[PDB]
């Protein structure tokens, strides 16, 4: 609606920052509402979600199993490792690490996954050759966070990042157990409170990632609706912004309010 690009043109103002928003149909494909659709933004902790993707896709083929025990060390430990800092003596299977990857954001557990492809360049080619020749990894943790301004690296675009997740969730690349474990990881998150669920109403399906990083940056990707089904996606990223995280985490929200009272 007119109203909801309103708030996101507020958010833009009382931010000092571009906001990229797409809320996108999940069965059709069309977008209904867009804004800088076509703006690079940095993913964050958002590429989460397309590397447990890339790791679903690999243990269709057989390539992965998701009952494979990683065992790892401490110095591969990096900032922000809720979970992965408890299992250095157990290690942990390859669907615990995207369970903490997604749900916690656990920055060594998404290292870990991303050795098990072969680094960003190979969850990169994943996303070329599932369509998308936007999105593109180029770092690890923490670095790919640096939001540099336009630096293209570790980037997405509001469209290029709501068709892909749409591809990931409901598309003919993966089986339908993947579809379903990567959207239960998400259903499960535990650190995007403050943000898209903030404005859900009791009954409603979310299944989200947000992410973080340098330069006022914030952002969160969803499919969510009415009577406990996802029916849409919503993406929304904003980069450049002297604000704190409380402002961008309420600016994403009343954005969310406004998508939620128009649906
Ligand atoms: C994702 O952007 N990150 C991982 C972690 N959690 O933040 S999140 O819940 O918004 O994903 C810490 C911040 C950030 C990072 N610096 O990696």
Redesign the pocket.
């Known amino acids: 609606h007119p109203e909801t690009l309103v708030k996101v043109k507020d958010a833009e103002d009382q931010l000092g920052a571009r906001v990229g928003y797409i809320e996108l149909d999940l069965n059709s494909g069309k977008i209904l509402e867009s804004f800088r659709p076509e703006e690079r933004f940095p993913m ?3 590429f ?1 979600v397309l590397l447990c993707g890339a790791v679903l896709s690999r243990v269709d083929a057989g390539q992965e199993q998701l009952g494979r025990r990683i065992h790892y060390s401490q110095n591969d430990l990096v ?2 490792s809720p979970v992965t800092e408890k299992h250095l003596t157990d290690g942990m299977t390859v669907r615990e690490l995207c369970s903490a990857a997604i749900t ?4 060594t557990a ?1 290292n870990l996954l991303l050795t098990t492809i072969g680094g960003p360049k190979e969850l990169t080619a994943f996303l070329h050759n599932m369509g998308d020749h936007v999105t593109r990894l180029d770092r690890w ?2 670095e ?2 640096e939001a540099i301004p336009n630096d293209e690296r570790d980037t997405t675009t509001p469209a290029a990042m709501a068709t892909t997740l749409r591809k990931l969730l409901t598309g003919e690349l993966l089986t339908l157990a993947s579809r379903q474990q990567l959207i239960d990881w998400m259903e499960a998150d535990k ?2 409170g403050p943000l898209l669920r903030s404005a859900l109403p009791a009954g409603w399906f979310i299944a989200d ?6 330069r006022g ?3 969160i990707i969803a499919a969510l609706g009415p009577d406990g089904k996802p029916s849409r996606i919503v993406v929304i990223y904003t980069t450049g912004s002297q604000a704190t995280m409380d402002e961008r985490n309420r600016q994403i929200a009343e954005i969310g309010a406004s998508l939620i009272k128009h649906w």
């Open positions: 964050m902790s958002t989460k900032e922000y916690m954001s656990d920055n998404a943790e923490p790919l966070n650190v995007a990632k947000s992410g973080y990083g340098e940056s914030r952002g």
